[PDB]
Amino acid sequence: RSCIDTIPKSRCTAFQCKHSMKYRLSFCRKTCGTC
Ligand SMILES: [Cl-]
Ligand SMILES: [Cl-]
Ligand SMILES: [Cl-]
Ligand SMILES: [Cl-]
């Protein structure tokens, strides 16, 4: 997958990164540090 967020990054919160796999893998790969 591409190393970009795919929703506005203000929604890529610490809470979502920590507690949601879909946010880590689909929506917020860059901001969550996934890639
Ligand atoms: Cl994939
Ligand atoms: Cl990548
Ligand atoms: Cl949140
Ligand atoms: Cl899920």
From Swiss-Prot:
GO MF annotation list: potassium channel regulator activity; toxin activity
Can you list the disulfide-bonded cysteine pairs? Answer: C3-C35, C12-C28, C17-C32
Give the site residues for Important residue for binding Kv1.3/KCNA3: I7, K9, R11, S20, M21, Y23, F27
Reported impact of S20 to Q/R: More than 25-fold decrease in potency of inhibition of Kv1.3/KCNA3
Keyword Lipid biosynthesis in annotation:
no
Provide the alphabetized UniProt keywords: Antibiotic, Antimicrobial, Disulfide bond, Ion channel impairing toxin, Nematocyst, Neurotoxin, Pharmaceutical, Potassium channel impairing toxin, Secreted, Toxin, Voltage-gated potassium channel impairing toxin
Upon changing K9Q, the result is: 10-fold decrease in potency of inhibition of Kv1.3/KCNA3
Its subcellular locations are: Secreted; Nematocyst
Q: Which GO BP annotation is one of this protein's?
A: defense response to bacterium
Site (described: Key residue for binding both Kv1.2/KCNA2 and Kv1.3/KCNA3 (occludes the channel pore like a cork in a bottle)): K22
Q: What's its job?
A: Peptide with both antimicrobial and neurotoxin activities. Inhibits voltage-dependent potassium channels. Potently blocks Kv1.1/KCNA1 (IC(50)=6.7-87 pM) and Kv1.3/KCNA3 (IC(50)=10-250 pM). Less potently blocks Kv1.4/KCNA4 (IC(50)=0.31 nM), and Kv1.6/KCNA6 (IC(50)=0.16 nM). Shows moderate activity on Kv1.2/KCNA2 (IC(50)=9 nM), Kv1.7/KCNA7 (IC(50)=11.5 nM), and KCa3.1/KCNN4 (Kd=0.03-30 nM). Blocks Kv channels by binding to a shallow vestibule at the outer entrance to the ion conduction pathway and occluding the entrance to the pore.
The name on file for this protein is Kappa-stichotoxin-She3a
Protein source organism = Stichodactyla helianthus
